[PDB]
Write an enzyme that holds these catalytic residues in place. Structure first.
Site, mmCIF file in Angstrom:
data_model
loop_
_atom_site.group_PDB
_atom_site.id
_atom_site.type_symbol
_atom_site.label_atom_id
_atom_site.label_comp_id
_atom_site.label_asym_id
_atom_site.label_seq_id
_atom_site.Cartn_x
_atom_site.Cartn_y
_atom_site.Cartn_z
ATOM 1 N N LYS A 25 74.764 -44.896 -80.240
ATOM 2 C CA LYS A 25 75.128 -45.698 -79.078
ATOM 3 C C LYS A 25 74.872 -47.180 -79.332
ATOM 4 O O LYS A 25 75.774 -48.011 -79.177
ATOM 5 C CB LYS A 25 74.359 -45.206 -77.854
ATOM 6 C CG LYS A 25 74.544 -46.051 -76.615
ATOM 7 C CD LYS A 25 73.952 -45.335 -75.409
ATOM 8 C CE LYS A 25 73.496 -46.300 -74.327
ATOM 9 N NZ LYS A 25 72.506 -45.652 -73.412
ATOM 10 N N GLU A 104 62.362 -49.445 -81.728
ATOM 11 C CA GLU A 104 61.094 -49.475 -81.009
ATOM 12 C C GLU A 104 60.556 -48.052 -80.928
ATOM 13 O O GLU A 104 61.320 -47.104 -80.737
ATOM 14 C CB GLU A 104 61.331 -50.065 -79.613
ATOM 15 C CG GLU A 104 60.145 -50.195 -78.683
ATOM 16 C CD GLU A 104 60.564 -50.600 -77.267
ATOM 17 O OE1 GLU A 104 59.938 -51.519 -76.699
ATOM 18 O OE2 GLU A 104 61.525 -50.010 -76.722
ATOM 19 N N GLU A 216 51.356 -63.968 -80.016
ATOM 20 C CA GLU A 216 50.837 -63.294 -78.835
ATOM 21 C C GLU A 216 49.512 -62.650 -79.216
ATOM 22 O O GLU A 216 49.051 -62.751 -80.359
ATOM 23 C CB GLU A 216 51.828 -62.265 -78.288
ATOM 24 C CG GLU A 216 52.247 -61.198 -79.270
ATOM 25 C CD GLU A 216 53.471 -60.425 -78.801
ATOM 26 O OE1 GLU A 216 54.503 -61.051 -78.469
ATOM 27 O OE2 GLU A 216 53.398 -59.184 -78.751
ATOM 28 N N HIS A 258 54.589 -54.478 -76.040
ATOM 29 C CA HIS A 258 54.567 -54.363 -77.490
ATOM 30 C C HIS A 258 53.386 -53.524 -77.956
ATOM 31 O O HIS A 258 52.246 -53.773 -77.555
ATOM 32 C CB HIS A 258 54.437 -55.742 -78.130
ATOM 33 C CG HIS A 258 55.679 -56.570 -78.100
ATOM 34 N ND1 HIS A 258 55.647 -57.941 -78.237
ATOM 35 C CD2 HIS A 258 56.984 -56.232 -77.989
ATOM 36 C CE1 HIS A 258 56.878 -58.414 -78.189
ATOM 37 N NE2 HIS A 258 57.710 -57.398 -78.041
HETATM 38 C C1 LIG Z 1 68.391 -48.096 -80.585
HETATM 39 C C2 LIG Z 1 67.566 -46.854 -80.961
HETATM 40 C C3 LIG Z 1 66.930 -47.059 -82.332
HETATM 41 C C4 LIG Z 1 68.489 -45.646 -81.038
HETATM 42 O O1 LIG Z 1 68.988 -45.335 -79.732
HETATM 43 P P1 LIG Z 1 70.497 -44.888 -79.534
HETATM 44 O O2 LIG Z 1 71.432 -45.781 -80.258
HETATM 45 O O3 LIG Z 1 70.677 -44.693 -78.078
HETATM 46 O O4 LIG Z 1 70.435 -43.477 -80.278
HETATM 47 P P2 LIG Z 1 71.587 -42.446 -80.683
HETATM 48 O O5 LIG Z 1 70.981 -41.097 -80.761
HETATM 49 O O6 LIG Z 1 72.771 -42.687 -79.832
HETATM 50 O O7 LIG Z 1 72.003 -42.943 -82.134
HETATM 51 C C5 LIG Z 1 71.119 -42.707 -83.247
HETATM 52 C C6 LIG Z 1 71.992 -42.391 -84.430
HETATM 53 O O8 LIG Z 1 71.224 -42.456 -85.651
HETATM 54 C C7 LIG Z 1 71.644 -41.376 -86.459
HETATM 55 N N1 LIG Z 1 70.659 -41.149 -87.500
HETATM 56 C C8 LIG Z 1 69.580 -40.312 -87.495
HETATM 57 N N2 LIG Z 1 68.873 -40.351 -88.603
HETATM 58 C C9 LIG Z 1 69.540 -41.280 -89.381
HETATM 59 C C10 LIG Z 1 69.284 -41.815 -90.658
HETATM 60 N N3 LIG Z 1 68.222 -41.460 -91.369
HETATM 61 N N4 LIG Z 1 70.125 -42.750 -91.142
HETATM 62 C C11 LIG Z 1 71.158 -43.129 -90.387
HETATM 63 N N5 LIG Z 1 71.502 -42.702 -89.169
HETATM 64 C C12 LIG Z 1 70.647 -41.778 -88.721
HETATM 65 C C13 LIG Z 1 71.861 -40.232 -85.485
HETATM 66 O O9 LIG Z 1 72.631 -39.191 -86.066
HETATM 67 C C14 LIG Z 1 72.634 -40.994 -84.416
HETATM 68 O O10 LIG Z 1 74.061 -41.052 -84.616
HETATM 69 P P3 LIG Z 1 75.063 -39.888 -84.088
HETATM 70 O O11 LIG Z 1 74.739 -39.687 -82.622
HETATM 71 O O12 LIG Z 1 74.745 -38.676 -84.938
HETATM 72 O O13 LIG Z 1 76.453 -40.437 -84.322
HETATM 73 C C15 LIG Z 1 66.451 -46.606 -79.914
HETATM 74 O O14 LIG Z 1 65.651 -45.489 -80.253
HETATM 75 C C16 LIG Z 1 65.582 -47.837 -79.705
HETATM 76 O O15 LIG Z 1 64.681 -48.106 -80.499
HETATM 77 N N6 LIG Z 1 65.868 -48.589 -78.647
HETATM 78 C C17 LIG Z 1 65.147 -49.811 -78.335
HETATM 79 C C18 LIG Z 1 65.481 -50.936 -79.302
HETATM 80 C C19 LIG Z 1 64.697 -52.188 -78.992
HETATM 81 O O16 LIG Z 1 64.665 -52.653 -77.855
HETATM 82 N N7 LIG Z 1 64.052 -52.739 -80.020
HETATM 83 C C20 LIG Z 1 63.359 -54.016 -79.930
HETATM 84 C C21 LIG Z 1 64.333 -55.175 -80.034
HETATM 85 S S1 LIG Z 1 63.421 -56.738 -79.974
HETATM 86 C C22 LIG Z 1 63.185 -56.924 -78.202
HETATM 87 O O17 LIG Z 1 63.557 -56.083 -77.424
HETATM 88 C C23 LIG Z 1 62.538 -58.217 -77.828
HETATM 89 O O18 LIG Z 1 62.214 -58.973 -78.984
HETATM 90 C C24 LIG Z 1 61.247 -57.974 -77.049
HETATM 91 O O19 LIG Z 1 60.308 -57.321 -77.880
HETATM 92 C C25 LIG Z 1 60.684 -59.297 -76.522
HETATM 93 O O20 LIG Z 1 59.522 -59.611 -76.871
HETATM 94 O O21 LIG Z 1 61.454 -60.003 -75.838
#
Ligand SMILES: CC(C)(COP(=O)(O)OP(=O)(O)OC[C@H]1O[C@@H](n2cnc3c(N)ncnc32)[C@H](O)[C@@H]1OP(=O)(O)O)[C@@H](O)C(=O)NCCC(=O)NCCSC(=O)[C@H](O)[C@@H](O)C(=O)O
Lengths: 306, 393
Positions: A25, A104, A216, A258
């Site tokens: 997604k 995350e 932070e 965090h």
């Molecule tokens: C986005 C994800 C990782 C995945 O969720 P989705 O995409 O829905 O998850 P899916 O389920 O829809 O999609 C995941 C896809 O991955 C595939 N797959 C699994 N293993 C592997 C592998 N070994 N290699 C390659 N692909 C693989 C899997 O088959 C699937 O593909 P398929 O379905 O089979 O086609 C979420 O878990 C998350 O981590 N979300 C939060 C992110 C976030 O916010 N990070 C911080 C940003 S920084 C910030 O926010 C500011 O800096 C803040 O900190 C501030 O201070 O302001």
């Protein structure tokens, strides 16, 4: 040593990117945005979907195959927490020069194991996890930040927080300064790139004339950066450094969103980080609203304007 | 998450760590029977609540003290009758106290010597570390201040695992000698393997010590857990006792929101943890008291904004709200219409100050101004904080 890969942080107009988690997604959404933006995204991986097409680009079963077929020099990871450390390790073993992990929620123990491998090689530089990515304005954007508020310029920014980076970016574009390179090292306690890694690049980059360091509560990376700045930015050809440290009002013993933002056993408070940075010559803005004006004034003092 | 004493001690015991013999009981008769099964010289009866200060607490039965020693199992049953089902109040509970549903009935052990031992991940050395002191039974932060020379560390390689040489060296620096040194080294090893197995962020044993009878025992311990590993620690997280958490925090966790209550009256929330922290800070810098931290996470989800208002309109301490949202690609007019919708449906009764950045901000601010609700817009974070502070009397 692993420090040899610091240079890979400086993405540019030749960086070719693959997306791990490409068909997911968020992988799909941010790749769609990246392609609309003109980013050199050339493919992606999802194990088991090699040979498929997605957004007009090839899908691969492995990073190794994707790298060989596209010549990719960077990867961005949108893989869910249970498998994201494995995805990072796959990119390391494939010797991708720059890996940006957005995920995350990776277990801290998983990241200690990833760091073990990371520190024993030097082909791959990891930014993250739990980070927004890296941008060289007008040349390359890897991650989730809004490109439009950035303008190529003179300030290098390194930050544990994407939202605070956006403040710093907007404030420094408004006053006419712009950004050389912005690195979001993310909010987790065990990660691939710290402040010093970025400071090394900034201090040696002729395009970077000043620095904003956004930190932070939690850990000792800000204090380590202060010591680095005393050693390497305290004599001739020094560059102005401005900082803001979040968490002055944080209670002890609580994780402030965090995973890495916690005052634990009396260690990690904001006041000590502010004082350490001040002692290294850093101008600490007490307010997050005044980063741009604070660095602008430092340029003025050094007759670095117009 | 937090574990009751009996839960953490069973988790340790199940992994080879030596703790006092005990049973758990949820009725006075079961406490009686448990006391007889111990066949111990002395028995300790301990009310199970998370808050500290049980020793000096008072039950609303009138019984003084949450920890009682006796040699008579019949006394254990009698005192348990005046604990179970009653509320235990301590200096660290609300004056209403905490309902006691279970008591621990344990063998009372004498402590001949006390030391400190903890295991955590070292954020400077990238790998587990053993932290120990022969000065046990006290705040480790105090030992570091008074006597930093009595703090010992062993850095462990996560793939090599703990080595006997490291465990023995720590045991010696903690003051164990002879066969007790060997016992302590073994217990350090079992504590290390426990730490990794359960995805702890810290296993802290204080006191880690000896009985007069010649046994090394983990007399008391505190375990902190990595929330990021819940998906692979379902059984441990199912033990989580939430009954002493702030209710608004428990509600926020149901919706994957990170809420932390503070002592103030200006609530706030932000879509990003760093700016969420800094918004609390800037409220303070401009003369206010933030009521809470609340991070929605990066990105825009209207449903998380709605849930955030649902949380805050419930807190009677809240006299004003400061919202800061970066809309990214989402049109801020859509966000603004969501805010007015939430404030109507959830009956906002306090002044709201909104800082929006993104596309279509002008229209968004017009939407907020024409809503007939107590909502004002801010042009930056400093303006937002000053407006929020000025909105409380
Ligand atoms: C986005 C994800 C990782 C995945 O969720 P989705 O995409 O829905 O998850 P899916 O389920 O829809 O999609 C995941 C896809 O991955 C595939 N797959 C699994 N293993 C592997 C592998 N070994 N290699 C390659 N692909 C693989 C899997 O088959 C699937 O593909 P398929 O379905 O089979 O086609 C979420 O878990 C998350 O981590 N979300 C939060 C992110 C976030 O916010 N990070 C911080 C940003 S920084 C910030 O926010 C500011 O800096 C803040 O900190 C501030 O201070 O302001």
């Amino acid at each position: 040593s692993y420090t040899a890969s610091r240079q890979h942080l400086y993405v540019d107009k030749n960086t070719k990117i693959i997306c791990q988690g490409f068909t997911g997604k968020q992988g799909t959404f941010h790749s769609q945005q990246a392609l609309e933006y003109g980013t050199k995204l050339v493919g992606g991986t999802t194990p088991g979907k090699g040979g498929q097409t997605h957004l007009g680009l090839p899908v691969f079963n492995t990073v190794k195959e994707a790298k060989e077929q596209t010549g990719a020099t960077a990867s961005v990871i949108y893989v869910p927490p249970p498998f994201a450390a494995a995805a990072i390790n796959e990119a390391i073993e494939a010797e991708i020069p720059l890996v940006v992990c957005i995920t995350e929620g990776i277990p801290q123990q998983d990241m200690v194991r990833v760091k073990h491998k990371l520190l024993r090689q030097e082909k791959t530089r990891l930014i993250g996890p739990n980070c927004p990515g890296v941008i060289n304005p007008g040349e390359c954007k890897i991650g989730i930040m809004p490109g439009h508020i950035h303008k190529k310029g003179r300030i290098g920014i390194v930050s544990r927080s994407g939202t605070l980076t956006y403040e710093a970016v907007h404030q420094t574009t408004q006053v006419g300064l712009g950004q050389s390179l912005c690195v979001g090292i993310g909010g987790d306690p065990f990660n691939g790139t710290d402040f010093i890694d970025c400071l090394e690049i900034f201090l040696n980059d002729s395009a970077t004339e000043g620095i904003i360091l956004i930190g932070e509560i939690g850990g000792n990376a800000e204090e380590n950066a202060a010591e680095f700045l005393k050693q390497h930015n305290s004599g001739p050809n020094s560059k102005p450094v401005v900082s803001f440290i979040a968490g002055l009002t944080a209670p002890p013993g609580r994780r402030m969103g965090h995973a890495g933002a916690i005052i634990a056993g009396g260690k990690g408070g904001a006041k000590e980080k502010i004082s350490a940075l001040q002692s290294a010559g850093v101008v600490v803005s007490m307010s997050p609203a005044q980063l741009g004006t604070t660095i602008y004034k430092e340029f003025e003092k050094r007759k670095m304007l117009e | 998450m937090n574990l009751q004493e009996y839960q953490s001690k069973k988790l340790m015991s199940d992994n080879g760590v030596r703790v006092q013999r005990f049973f758990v009981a949820d009725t006075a008769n079961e406490a009686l029977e448990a006391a007889k099964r111990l066949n111990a010289k002395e028995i300790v009866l301990k009310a199970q609540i998370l808050a500290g200060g049980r020793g000096k607490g008072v039950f609303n039965s009138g019984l003084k003290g949450g920890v009682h020693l006796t040699k008579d199992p019949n006394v254990v049953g009698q005192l348990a009758k005046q604990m179970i089902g009653y509320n235990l109040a301590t200096k660290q509970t609300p004056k209403e106290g905490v309902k006691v549903n279970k008591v621990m009935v344990a063998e009372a052990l004498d402590i001949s010597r006390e030391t400190y031992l903890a295991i955590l991940m070292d954020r400077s050395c990238n790998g587990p570390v053993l932290v120990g002191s022969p000065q046990g039974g006290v705040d480790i932060e105090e030992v570091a201040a008074s006597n930093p020379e009595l703090i010992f560390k062993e850095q462990i390689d996560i793939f090599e695992g703990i080595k006997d040489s490291q465990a023995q060296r720590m045991a010696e620096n903690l003051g164990f000698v002879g066969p007790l040194k060997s016992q302590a080294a073994d217990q350090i090893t079992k504590l290390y393997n426990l730490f990794l197995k359960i995805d702890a962020t810290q296993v802290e044993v204080n006191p880690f010590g000896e009985t007069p009878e010649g046994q090394v025992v983990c007399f008391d311990a505190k375990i902190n857990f990595d929330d990021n590993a819940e998906f692979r620690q379902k059984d441990i997280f199912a033990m989580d006792d939430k009954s002493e958490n702030e209710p608004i925090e428990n509600e926020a966790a149901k919706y994957d929101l990170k809420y932390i209550g503070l002592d103030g009256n200006i609530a706030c929330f932000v879509n990003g943890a760093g700016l969420a922290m800094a918004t609390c800070d800037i409220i303070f810098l401009n003369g206010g008291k933030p009521a809470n931290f609340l991070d929605l996470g990066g990105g825009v989800k209207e449903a998380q904004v709605y849930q955030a208002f649902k949380l805050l309109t419930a807190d009677p301490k809240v006299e004003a709200i400061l919202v800061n949202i970066f809309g990214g690609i989402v049109n801020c007019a859509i966000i603004a219409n969501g805010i007015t919708k939430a404030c109507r449906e959830l009956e906002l009764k306090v002044p709201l100050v909104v800082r929006l950045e993104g596309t279509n901000v002008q229209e968004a601010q017009k939407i907020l101004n024409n809503s007939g609700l107590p909502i004002t817009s801010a042009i930056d974070l400093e303006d937002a904080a000053k407006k929020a502070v000025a909105s409380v009397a």
